Paper text:
Leucine-rich repeat kinase (LRRK) 1 is a multidomain protein which, near-uniquely, contains both a Ras-like GTPase domain and kinase domain in the same polypeptide chain. LRRK1 consists of N-terminal ankyrin repeats, leucine-rich repeats, and C-terminal Roc (Ras-of-complex) GTPase domain, COR (C-terminal of Roc) scaffolding domain, kinase domain and a WD40 repeat domain at the C-terminus. Despite this, the exact physiological roles of both LRRK1 and LRRK2 remain unclear. Both LRRK1 and LRRK2 phosphorylate distinct subsets of Rab GTPases on a conserved serine or threonine residue, thereby modulating interactions between the Rab proteins and their effectors. Instead, it phosphorylates Rab7, a key player in lysosomal biogenesis and trafficking.
Here, we report the cryo-EM structure of the monomeric full-length LRRK1, and a lower-resolution map of the LRRK1 dimer. Subsequent processing resulted in a 3.9 Å resolution map of the LRRK1 monomer and a 6.4 Å map of the LRRK1 dimer. Local refinement improved the resolution of the C-terminal Roc-COR/kinase/WD40 catalytic domains to 3.8 Å in the LRRK1 monomer map. The overall structure of the LRRK1 monomer is ‘O-shaped’. The structure is relatively compact, with the Roc, COR, kinase and WD40 domains arranged in a ‘J-shape’. The leucine-rich repeats bridge the Roc-COR and WD40 domains, although they do not form direct contacts with the WD40 domain. The ankyrin repeats are not well defined in the density, implying that they are flexible in the monomer, although poorly defined density N-terminal of the LRRs in the monomer map may correspond to the ankyrin repeats. However, we included GDP in the atomic model as we did observe density for GDP in the Roc active site, likely representing endogenous GDP. In the structure, the LRRK1 kinase domain is in an inactive conformation, and packs closely to the COR-B domain. The kinase regulatory (R)-spine is broken, the αC helix is in the ‘out’ position, and the conserved K1270/E1307 ion pair is broken (between the αC helix and N-lobe, equivalent to the K72/E91 ion pair in PKA), all markers of an inactive kinase.
Author numbering: 341 to 369, 378 to 511, 540 to 612, 621 to 629, 637 to 826, 843 to 910, 919 to 957, 963 to 1046, ...
Write the structure that this text describes.
C-alpha cells in the first residue's frame, strides 16, 4: 500500500492500526481513541500536524526507519513510547515536556543526524529509556537543568561528545552507560557517582590513557569495555584495582613438653632466655621483624601477631579451634627425643592441614644442644628425612591431606647456645612471600580499643554481630558501605589474630582460652551427683553476667556444655570412670548378633569425651519426641555409659560401644567394639555419628603418607568365631553388587551378608516394601531419566507389575579402593536417611514409596502421569491458566502438604514449580498434585524460607545470582492490580509472605484453615465507581451498565463492566432529569425518569410516553407471540401497563391494568382492606416457561397471564402491613418451579410450588449464624434482595454477607461473608450480572458506591468444593495405618 485510505480517519473507535512493511509514501491522501499505531519502515518524508493532532489519547508512536526531515510538534496526549530511530531528522521540537513530561517513557532516536539536543528534552520525569546512537552530538545541555530522574539506560555511543557533566540523581536509577565510539580522552568526575550502574562501555576511544581511581566506588558495575583502547594503568575481575582505592598471624604449636616458649624471646630479642614462662595456655604480643642480610624486594617492616597455643597435655581437640587460614604455622619439636617425636608430630601436621588449608607450615627443632657435634650433621639429616618422609610420599609426591613442606622448611634454634637464631629470622621473613585495607586498618584500632576498655572492667571479651556493626559504624572515617566488604572486613580481621569467626565473634583468645580452663577444672567438686550432670543454677558460680543465653551457646559448639532434659547440663571431661554393674554379662544371647570393630590408628584424648557425650544428646532426642538423622526411633532404656563406651537396651537389644584392645596384623592400638543384637531391626546410629564426629575433629582419617589409611573398619566372621576380621574395604564393595562372599578361611562356606553386615542391607524396614528386580523392568537410557537431584540420585522410568514408577537408584562410580569404599559407605549412610524420612510419610499429597531394592540398590517412587506443574503451565502461559476452580484446589493441596511436613518437623528447600508433580487436572476427582520433600531440619533454610518461595511458586500460578538477588533487600515482582485478576482474596497472600519480616508470614496450618472459608475462592475483587446515586443492572451478558449520577445536565451514567473490571464510560454528559428505572434487552433500552414518563434508546430520548404514576421496575417476558418480549411493569400506584416491543410500532398503547379493580371484583376484596392500599409494585418474574407471570403487591402476590392479560389467582404469603421486596423463579433442578419471595421488615423467605401454589417452607433469614443451618420443606441482618445463581438461591444481607441456600429439605450451605469490606459501607442493592458472577454494591454514608463481586457458584461447584476440602482431611486423619 502506498497510502492509508481516508476512511480510516472517520473511525473514531479505532485503537490499533498496523501498516508496517509497506510502501506508504504518505500516511494519507476522529481517531481520538487510537492507542497503538506504527508507520515505520515506510517512505514517509514529512508528518502533517493536522492528522497527528487528532490522536488525543495515543499511547505508542513509531516513525522509525523513515525519511523524515522535520519532526512534528507535540500535542496534548498521554503518549507513552515514541520511536524515531534510523531517520534523517536534523531537528527536534522543544515542547515535549508540556504534555509528555509525565507520560512519555521510551524514546528511540538512534542512527540520526542531530548535532545537538534541546534542553527541555531532559525535563521528562517519566522517561524510561533513551537512545542516541550514531548521532553527531558534539555538545550536551547543562546538567543543572535536567529533571529526568527515572531514566534507567542512557545510550550515547557513536557520538562526538568531548570534542561534559550529568546530574547525580541518575546514580540510583541508571544501570547502563553507553559511551563507545566516542572522542572522549578523560573521564569526568561525575561518572564515579552512579552507584546503580551495571555496565560500562567506553571503548574505541584513542584518547584514553588513564582511569581515575574513584571509578571503583560503584559496586554494581560489572562490565568494563577495554576493546581498542590504548590504556596504560590496566594490568596485563577488572574492578579489583579500582575497588581498592603487613599484619600476619603466626601460630606455634607442638607437643606439650619441650620449650614452645623459649623460641619466642630468641626470635623476639637476642641473648639467652631470661624470663620464666611457667605454664600458660596462650600469650600474645606484636613481635617486630626487620629486614636481615640478603633481604630484597620486600617491605622494610613486617609485624607478626606472635602466638603460642600451649597446654599441659590437656586442651587437645579444642585448641584446634584457634586455627585460621592464611597463617604461618611453625611447629616446635625437640631434636633430642629421637624418631618417636616425629610420629607424635604426625597428629599436629595432619590436624593443621585438615583445619587450616593453604597455610604455610614450618618445622623447627629446638633443644638440640644435647646432640653431640661429632655426629650432628649426620643426625639432623636422618631426623629431617623422617619428618620429610611424613609430608612426602615414598614416590616423592606430597602426601594426601598434608601441608606443603619442602626440604628448605626444617631448621634449628638452639635456645641456650643461640646458634642458628639468625637463620630463622631470614627464612621467616622470606617464607612470608607468595601471599579496602585503609578502612580495615581503621577498624583495627576500634577493636583493639574495644579490647582495652573491657580489660580494665573484666567485661565479657566477646563481641556479637549486634555489638559489632554498631562498633564498625561508630569508628571515625567509617566508609563501610558494601555488605560484602563488611563480611570481608571480619574475614580479613580473622587473619590478624584480633577476631575469631567460629562458623558470634570472639576477639581476645586469652580470655577465651582461660574461660575454658576453669570449666576444664571442675574435677574437684561435690561429685556433681556422679554420671556427669550439672544443674544450670549450680553452674552459675562456676567472667559472666546474665549472658547465659550466648555464653552457654558457644560452649555447645565446643562439645563441652551440651544441654540435657529436666534442666541439666553435662560435662564430657567429668564422665563416670567405669560403672560396671556386671556389664557384658549375659548381654550375648547370640541371636542376630552383629559386631563391628574400628582401628582409628591412634586414639586421641578428646575423642571419648566428645563422642559419648555426643551419643547421649542425640540418643535423648529420639525418646523425647515420643540432612539430619531420622533413624533409630526405638525406645531407650537404662542408658548405662562410662568414660569410654555406653550400653543402651532397645527392644531388648544391647547396643554396646565399649572400647578394648584390637589386634590386626599390628596387634596394638585401641578400637571400637560395636555390637547390636535384637529381635530383627539392625540400626546403626553409632557408625553414622562416629563417621560424622571426624568432621568436627579431623586428623583421624590418617593416610600415614605411605598409602596406609589406618582408619580401618573390621567385622568378625560368625563362622570363624565358632579371630579373623573381615575388612570393610571389600565387604561393602562386595555388598554393592552381590549377596555372598568367600571367607579367606572358609572359601567353600559363603557367609550371608545379611548377617555379616545387616545395616548395609537395612533389614530395619518392614518386609512389606522390599522391591524386587525380577518383576520390575526399567532402562538406564537418558530418555527415561527424569533429571537429577545431586550426589547421584538418578531417576529412571520403571514398570512395577505394569504400573509405571520412577525409581531413584544411586548411581555413583567416583589406595583407590578406599576412596570407593568411603564413597559407597556414604551412599548407604544417606540412602537410609532419605528412605527413613520418606517411608514415614503417608500423607495423600506426598509421594510415598512403593518398594526398596538392594540388587540393584534402588527404590521406586510414585510417578505423576501428567508431568510437572511447570511443564503443564508452559503451553497455557489469559490469566488463571489452570482455571478458576482448579487454582483453589491446587493452592490448597500445596498448603496441605506444607502443613503436614512442617508439622512433621520437615523443612523444604527450593520450593519450585518444577518440583510440583500434577496427577489430574479434572475438577471432579479429588487429589491433583503432590510434593517431593528435599531435606529436613532439627526442631539457606529457616523454616519459613519456603513460605517466601511459596509466593514465587504460586506467583507463576496466577500468571540465580543476579537473576534472583533483589529478594535480599525485598522487591516485589511484577503483579497485576487486584481489580483485574478477579481472584483478589488469594492475592493477599502475595502481599503476605513477600516481606523481609519472617514472623509476619502465617503458619502452614493457618493457610490451610483459611481454605475452609468458601469466601476465599468466590470473591473476585473490590471496585470503586466514585459517587453515584443508584445501582442498576441489565439482562444478558452486558453486566451492570449504568450507575447513574448527577441531576439534569449533570445526570451521567458510569458504565462498569465486571468481567474486565474497567469503566469504558466514566461520567459522560447526557441530557435528562432524575431517573428511577431502566431495562436493557437485545439492543433496546427502556429508561424511565421519576417524571412519570418513559424514554427509549437504540443502544437523546427516541420517544416519551407518560405514565399515571412513577414506575418502579421493569421486566420483559417471553410470551413467544410474534417474538414479543412484553414489558409489562408496575408503577407506584400499583397498576401495571403493557407496551409493545417492536421499534417499528408507535409504542403508545399503554393497555394498563387496574390491579385494585380486579381485586375488588374477582376476589371480592373490599377497599377497606389493607391489601387495597396502593403499594408500589416491586418486581415481576417469569414462570410456566413465560406462560404465566407473578408480580409484587404489598403483602400479596398478584398473578398475571400472557394469554388473557387478566389476574386469575390471589395469593397472600405475608400478613399486613408487610411489603415484599423481590421475587425470583429458578426452575433448575427438574421442572417444579420453586419461586421465592422476601420481606422489607420481617426479613422472611417463602417456598412456593408454581402448580400447587402452596407455602412449602418459610425459612427465617434473621439467624446471626446461618453456617450450615436448616429449615424444613414440605441492622446488619436484614435480607436485601433475592436473586438466583443457576440452581442455588442467594440472600444478600445489609451487613455485607450473602446467605446462599440449597433446595425435600432446604439446607443453607455457605455464608460468603466478606469481613474485609465493612468500612466500605452498607449493601443496598445487589443483582446478578451473568450466570457465572454476582455483584453487590456497597454504599457508604458519603454516597460513594463500592463494587464487590462474587463468583456465581451453583449447587455443583459448592458441593464439589466442600467435598474436596473434607475428603483430603479424611484421607489423612482417618488413615490410622
Ligand atoms: N637448656 C635448654 N632448655 C630448653 C631449650 N628449649 C626449651 N628448653 C626448656 O623448655 C622449658 C619451657 O617449656 P614450656 O614453656 O613450659 O613448654 P610449653 O608449656 O609447651 O610452652 C624451659 O624451662 C627450658 O629450660 C634449649 O634449647 N635448651
Amino acid at each position: 500500500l502506498s497510502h492509508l485510505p481516508p476512511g480510516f480517519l472517520h473511525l473514531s473507535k479505532l485503537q490499533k492500526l498496523t501498516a508496517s512493511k509497506n510502501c506508504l509514501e504518505k500516511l494519507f491522501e476522529g481517531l481520538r481513541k487510537l492507542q497503538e499505531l506504527d508507520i515505520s519502515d515506510n517512505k514517509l518524508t514529512e508528518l502533517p500536524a493536522l492528522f497527528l493532532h487528532s490522536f488525543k489519547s495515543l499511547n505508542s508512536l513509531n516513525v522509525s526507519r523513515n525519511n523524515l526531515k522535520v519532526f512534528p510538534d507535540p500535542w496534548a496526549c498521554p503518549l507513552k513510547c515514541c520511536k524515531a530511530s534510523r531517520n534523517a531528522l536534523e531537528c527536534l521540537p522543544d515542547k515535549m515536556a508540556v504534555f509528555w513530561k509525565n507520560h512519555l517513557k521510551d524514546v528511540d532516536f538512534s542512527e540520526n543526524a542531530l548535532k545537538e539536543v534541546p534542553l527541555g528534552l531532559f525535563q521528562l520525569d517519566a522517561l524510561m529509556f533513551l537512545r542516541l546512537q550514531g548521532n553527531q552530538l558534539a555538545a550536551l545541555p547543562p546538567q543543572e537543568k535536567w529533571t529526568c530522574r527515572q531514566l534507567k539506560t542512557l545510550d550515547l555511543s557513536r557520538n562526538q561528545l568531548g570534542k561534559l557533566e550529568f546530574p547525580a540523581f541518575l546514580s540510583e536509577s541508571l544501570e547502563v552507560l553507553c559511551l563507545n565510539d566516542n572522542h572522549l580522552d578523560t573521564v569526568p568526575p561525575s561518572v564515579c557517582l552512579l552507584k546503580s550502574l551495571s555496565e560500562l562501555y567506553l571503548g574505541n576511544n584513542p584518547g584514553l590513557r588513564e582511569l581515575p581511581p574513584e571509578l571503583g566506588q560503584l559496586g554494581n558495575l560489572w562490565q568494563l569495555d577495554t576493546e581498542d583502547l590504548t590504556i596504560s594503568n590496566v594490568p596485563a575481575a577488572m574492578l579489583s584495582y579500582l575497588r581498592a582505592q603487613k599484619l600476619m598471624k603466626m601460630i606455634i604449636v607442638g607437643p606439650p613438653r619441650q620449650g614452645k616458649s623459649t623460641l619466642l624471646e630468641i626470635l623476639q630479642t637476642g641473648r639467652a632466655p631470661q624470663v620464666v614462662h611457667g605454664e600458660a595456655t596462650i600469650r600474645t604480643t606484636k613481635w617486630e621483624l626487620q629486614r636481615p642480610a640478603g633481604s630484597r624486594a620486600k617491605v622494610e617492616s613486617v609485624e607478626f601477631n606472635v602466638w603460642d597455643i600451649g597446654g599441659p597435655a590437656s586442651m587437645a581437640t579444642v585448641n584446634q579451634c584457634f586455627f585460621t587460614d592464611k597463617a604461618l604455622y611453625v611447629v616446635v619439636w625437640n631434636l633430642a627425643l629421637g624418631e618417636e617425636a616425629v610420629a607424635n608430630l604426625q597428629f599436629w601436621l595432619l590436624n593443621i592441614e585438615a583445619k587450616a588449608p593453604n597455610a604455610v607450615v614450618l618445622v623447627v627443632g629446638t633443644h638440640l644442644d644435647l646432640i653431640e657435634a661429632k655426629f650432628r650433621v649426620e643426625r639432623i639429616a636422618t631426623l629431617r628425612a623422617y619428618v620429610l618422609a611424613l609430608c612426602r610420599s615414598p614416590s616423592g609426591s606430597r602426601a594426601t591431606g598434608f601441608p606443603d613442606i619442602t626440604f628448605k622448611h626444617l631448621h634449628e634454634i638452639s635456645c641456650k647456645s643461640l646458634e642458628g637464631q639468625e637463620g630463622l629470622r631470614q627464612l621467616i621473613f622470606h617464607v612470608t612471600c607468595s601471599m579496602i585495607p585503609r578502612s580495615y586498618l581503621s577498624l583495627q584500632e576500634a577493636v583493639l580499643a574495644e579490647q582495652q576498655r573491657r580489660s580494665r572492667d573484666d567485661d565479657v571479651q566477646y563481641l556479637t554481630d549486634r555489638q559489632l556493626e554498631q562498633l564498625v559504624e561508630q569508628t571515625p572515617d567509617n566508609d563501610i558501605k558494601d555488605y560484602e566488604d563488611l563480611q570481608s572486613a571480619i574475614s580479613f580481621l580473622i587473619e590478624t589474630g584480633t577476631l575469631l569467626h567460629f562458623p558470634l565473634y570472639f576477639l581476645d583468645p586469652i580470655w577465651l582460652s582461660e574461660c575454658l580452663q576453669r570449666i576444664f577444672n571442675i574435677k574437684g567438686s561435690r561429685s556433681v551427683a556422679k554420671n556427669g550432670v550439672i544443674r544450670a543454677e549450680d553452674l552459675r558460680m562456676l567472667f559472666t553476667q546474665q549472658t547465659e543465653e550466648q555464653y552457654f551457646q558457644f560452649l555447645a559448639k565446643f562439645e563441652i556444655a551440651l544441654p540435657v532434659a529436666n534442666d541439666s547440663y553435662l560435662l564430657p571431661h567429668l564422665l563416670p570412670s567405669k560403672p560396671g554393674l556386671d556389664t557384658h554379662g549375659m548381654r550375648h544371647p547370640t541371636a542376630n548378633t552383629i559386631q563391628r570393630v574400628f582401628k582409628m590408628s591412634f586414639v586421641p584424648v578428646g575423642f571419648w569425651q566428645r563422642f559419648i557425650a555426643r551419643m547421649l544428646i542425640s540418643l535423648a532426642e529420639m525418646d523425647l519426641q515420643l540432612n539430619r538423622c531420622s533413624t533409630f526411633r526405638v525406645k531407650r532404656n537404662q542408658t548405662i555409659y562410662w568414660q569410654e563406651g555406653l550400653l543402651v537396651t532397645f527392644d531388648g537389644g544391647y547396643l554396646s560401644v565399649e572400647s578394648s584392645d584390637v589386634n590386626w596384623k599390628k596387634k596394638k592400638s585401641g578400637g571400637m567394639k560395636i555390637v547390636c543384637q535384637s529381635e530383627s531391626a539392625m540400626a546403626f546410629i553409632t557408625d553414622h555419628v562416629n563417621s560424622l564426629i571426624d568432621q568436627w575433629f579431623p586428623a583421624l582419617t590418617a593416610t600415614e603418607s605411605d598409602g596406609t589409611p589406618l582408619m580401618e573398619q573390621y567385622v568378625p566372621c560368625p563362622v570363624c568365631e565358632t579371630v579373623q576380621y573381615f575388612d570393610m574395604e571389600d565387604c561393602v564393595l562386595t555388598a554393592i553388587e552381590r549377596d555372598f562372599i568367600s571367607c579367606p578361611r572358609h572359601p567353600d562356606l559363603p557367609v550371608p551378608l545379611q548377617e555379616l553386615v545387616p545395616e548395609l542391607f537395612m533389614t530395619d524396614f518392614p518386609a512389606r516394601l522390599f522391591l524386587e528386580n525380577s518383576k520390575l523392568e526399567h532402562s538406564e537410557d537418558e530418555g527415561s531419566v527424569l533429571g537429577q537431584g545431586g550426589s547421584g540420585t538418578v531417576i529412571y522410568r520403571a514398570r512395577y507389575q505394569g504400573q509405571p514408577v520412577a525409581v531413584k537408584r544411586f548411581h555413583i562410580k567416583k589406595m583407590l579402593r578406599h576412596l570407593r569404599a568411603t564413597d559407597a559407605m556414604k551412599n548407604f549412610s544417606e540412602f537410609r536417611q532419605e528412605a527413613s524420612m520418606l517411608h514415614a510419610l503417608q500423607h495423600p499429597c506426598i509421594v510415598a514409596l512403593i518398594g526398596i531394592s538392594i540388587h540393584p540398590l534402588c527404590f521406586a517412587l510414585e510417578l505423576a502421569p501428567l508431568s510437572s506443574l511447570n511443564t503443564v503451565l508452559s503451553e497455557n502461559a489469559s490469566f488463571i491458566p489452570l482455571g478458576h476452580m482448579l487454582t483453589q484446589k491446587i493452592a490448597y493441596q500445596i498448603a496441605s502438604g506444607l502443613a503436614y511436613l512442617h508439622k512433621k518437623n520437615i523443612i523444604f528447600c527450593d520450593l519450585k514449580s518444577d518440583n510440583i508433580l500434577v496427577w489430574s487436572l479434572d475438577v471432579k476427582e479429588h487429589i491433583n498434585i503432590k510434593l517431593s520433600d528435599y531435606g529436613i531440619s532439627r526442631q539457606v533454610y529457616d523454616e519459613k524460607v519456603d513460605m517466601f518461595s511459596y509466593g514465587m511458586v504460586l506467583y507463576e500460578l496466577l500468571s540465580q545470582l543476579q537473576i534472583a538477588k533483589k529478594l535480599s533487600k525485598g522487591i516485589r515482582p511484577v503483579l497485576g492490580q487486584p481489580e483485574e485478576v478477579q481472584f483478589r482474596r488469594l492475592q493477599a497472600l502475595m502481599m503476605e509472605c513477600w516481606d523481609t519480616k519472617p514472623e509476619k508470614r502465617p503458619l502452614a496450618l493457618s493457610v490451610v484453615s483459611q481454605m475452609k472459608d468458601p469466601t476465599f475462592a468466590t470473591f473476585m475483587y473490590e471496585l470503586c465507581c466514585g459517587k453515584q446515586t443508584a445501582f442498576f443492572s441489565s439482562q444478558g451478558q452486558e453486566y451492570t451498565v449504568v450507575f447513574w449520577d448527577g441531576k439534569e445536565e449533570s445526570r451521567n451514567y458510569t458504565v462498569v463492566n465486571t468481567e474486565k473490571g474497567l469503566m469504558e464510560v466514566q461520567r459522560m454528559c447526557c441530557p435528562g432529569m432524575k431517573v428511577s428505572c431502566q431495562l436493557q434487552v437485545q439492543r433496546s433500552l427502556w429508561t424511565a425518569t421519576e417524571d412519570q414518563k418513559i424514554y427509549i434508546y437504540t443502544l437523546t430520548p427516541q420517544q416519551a410516553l407518560d405514565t399515571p404514576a412513577v414506575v418502579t421496575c421493569f421486566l420483559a417476558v417471553p410470551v413467544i407471540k410474534k417474538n414479543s418480549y412484553l414489558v409489562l411493569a408496575g408503577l407506584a400506584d400499583g397498576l401495571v401497563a403493557v407496551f409493545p416491543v417492536v421499534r417499528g410500532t408507535p409504542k403508545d398503547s399503554c393497555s394498563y391494568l387496574c390491579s385494585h379493580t380486579a381485586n375488588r371484583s374477582k376476589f371480592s376484596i373490599a377497599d377497606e382492606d389493607a391489601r387495597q392500599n396502593p403499594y408500589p409494585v416491586k418486581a415481576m418474574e417469569v414462570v410456566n416457561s413465560g406462560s404465566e407471570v407473578w408480580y409484587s403487591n404489598g403483602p400479596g402476590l398478584l398473578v398475571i397471564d400472557c394469554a388473557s392479560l387478566e389476574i386469575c389467582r390471589r395469593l397472600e404469603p405475608y400478613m399486613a402491613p408487610s411489603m415484599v421486596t423481590s421475587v425470583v423463579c429458578s426452575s433448575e433442578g427438574r421442572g417444579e418451579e420453586v419461586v421465592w419471595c422476601l420481606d422489607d421488615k420481617a426479613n422472611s423467605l417463602v417456598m412456593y410450588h408454581s402448580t400447587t401454589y402452596q407455602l412449602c417452607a418459610r425459612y427465617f433469614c434473621g439467624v446471626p449464624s446461618p453456617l450450615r443451618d436448616m429449615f424444613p420443606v414440605r441492622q446488619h441482618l436484614q435480607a436485601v434482595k433475592i436473586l438466583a445463581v443457576r440452581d442455588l438461591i442467594w440472600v444478600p444481607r445489609r451487613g455485607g454477607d450473602v446467605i446462599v441456600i440449597g433446595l425435600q429439605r432446604g439446607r443453607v450451605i455457605a455464608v460468603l461473608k466478606a469481613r474485609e469490606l465493612t468500612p466500605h459501607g452498607v449493601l443496598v442493592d445487589a443483582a446478578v450480572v451473568a450466570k457465572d458472577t454476582v455483584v453487590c454494591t456497597f454504599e457508604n454514608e458519603n454516597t460513594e458506591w463500592c463494587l464487590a463481586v462474587w463468583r456465581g457458584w451453583g449447587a455443583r461447584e459448592f458441593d464439589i468444593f466442600y467435598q474436596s476440602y473434607e475428603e483430603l482431611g479424611r484421607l489423612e486423619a482417618c488413615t490410622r495405618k
